[PDB]
Amino acid sequence: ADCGLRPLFEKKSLEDKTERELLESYI
Amino acid sequence: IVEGSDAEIGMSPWQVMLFRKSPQELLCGASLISDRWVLTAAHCLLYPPWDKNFTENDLLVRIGKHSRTRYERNIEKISMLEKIYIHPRYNWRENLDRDIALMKLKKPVAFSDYIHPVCLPDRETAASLLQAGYKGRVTGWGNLKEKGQPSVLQVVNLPIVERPVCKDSTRIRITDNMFCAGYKPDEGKRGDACEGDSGGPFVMKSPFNNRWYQMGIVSWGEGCDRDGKYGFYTHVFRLKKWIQKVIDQF
Amino acid sequence: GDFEEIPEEYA
Numbered sequence A: 001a002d003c004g005l006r007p008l009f010e011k012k013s014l015e016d017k018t019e020r021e022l023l024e025s026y027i
Numbered sequence B: 001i002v003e004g005s006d007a008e009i010g011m012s013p014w015q016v017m018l019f020r021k022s023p024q025e026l027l028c029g030a031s032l033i034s035d036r037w038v039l040t041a042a043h044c045l046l047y048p049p050w051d052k053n054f055t056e057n058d059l060l061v062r063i064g065k066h067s068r069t070r071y072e073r074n075i076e077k078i079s080m081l082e083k084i085y086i087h088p089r090y091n092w093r094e095n096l097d098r099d100i101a102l103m104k105l106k107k108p109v110a111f112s113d114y115i116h117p118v119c120l121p122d123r124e125t126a127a128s129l130l131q132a133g134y135k136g137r138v139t140g141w142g143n144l145k146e147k148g149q150p151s152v153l154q155v156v157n158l159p160i161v162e163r164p165v166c167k168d169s170t171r172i173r174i175t176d177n178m179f180c181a182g183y184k185p186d187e188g189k190r191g192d193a194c195e196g197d198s199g200g201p202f203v204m205k206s207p208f209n210n211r212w213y214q215m216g217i218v219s220w221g222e223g224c225d226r227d228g229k230y231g232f233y234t235h236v237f238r239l240k241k242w243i244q245k246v247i248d249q250f
Numbered sequence C: 001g002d003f004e005e006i007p008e009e010y011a
């Protein structure tokens, strides 16, 4: 449903300080 | 959490603190998976070798927290437990195999900017993200090492480690229901969960649908952030059938 | 007394 979508981040299209580190590791 | 950093506000809205009623203290971490269900590690509630066997009335769940010790008025929500469900094959006698437990809340918690559930992985998401090198995120209010306690929730990103390396790092028997994560000595970077972080979530953000999934539960480790050692996590997807069975039945 | 007391409504 709406699980895993954070109100203060994904919901308003804002990224947290280190989530990019995770994305970059998913090669 | 060792070698981590302060979490941002609302960064891990599924984070749950398992709080002991008396004496009032941090017992473990946990995660919110729905308005009435909380996921944690079985050893947080049951570990006979240490005379640990908590019942519903012994603890409370605190949701929406950031500060470790302060009562966050108008932000956090405290819930009582209706029932605890420990995996019937949880191996507390040996290696903590199947280290998983569910807690049903007496009343549904209201979601907010600070309280929101995490997703549980499907077979495909698990197969795609559970690969050596891929990083997950661990959060908790546990020890900063073998020192003191943090003022606020800590976070650290760690890479999943190859199974042979996990196995060769310890004398404990590793099973398919566990995976390990952490940096290798040659990688330089550090980080690990520590005392008090047990039961908390190891999450990954799917690059396919941009949703956060809980792939593991902080289970066990030998020391914290030691070179050549790795933290071990309960493989959530491998135990999802049990999770679904419990929720469907109760 | 490491933690701040919580409302009595949750002892």
Ligand SMILES: N=C(N)Nc1ccc(C[C@H](NC(=O)CSc2ccc(Cl)cc2)C(N)=O)cc1
Pocket (backbone or CB within 6 Å): B192, B193, B194, B195, B196, B197, B198, B218, B219, B220, B221, B222, B223, B224, B230, B231, B232, B233
């Ligand atoms: N508090 C003390 N003075 N000593 C002490 C406390 C706990 C243990 C149990 C042992 N845990 C640890 O050594 C560190 S906690 C920990 C738990 C999970 C993960 Cl993924 C990483 C670190 C484990 N088997 O997980 C052993 C000794």
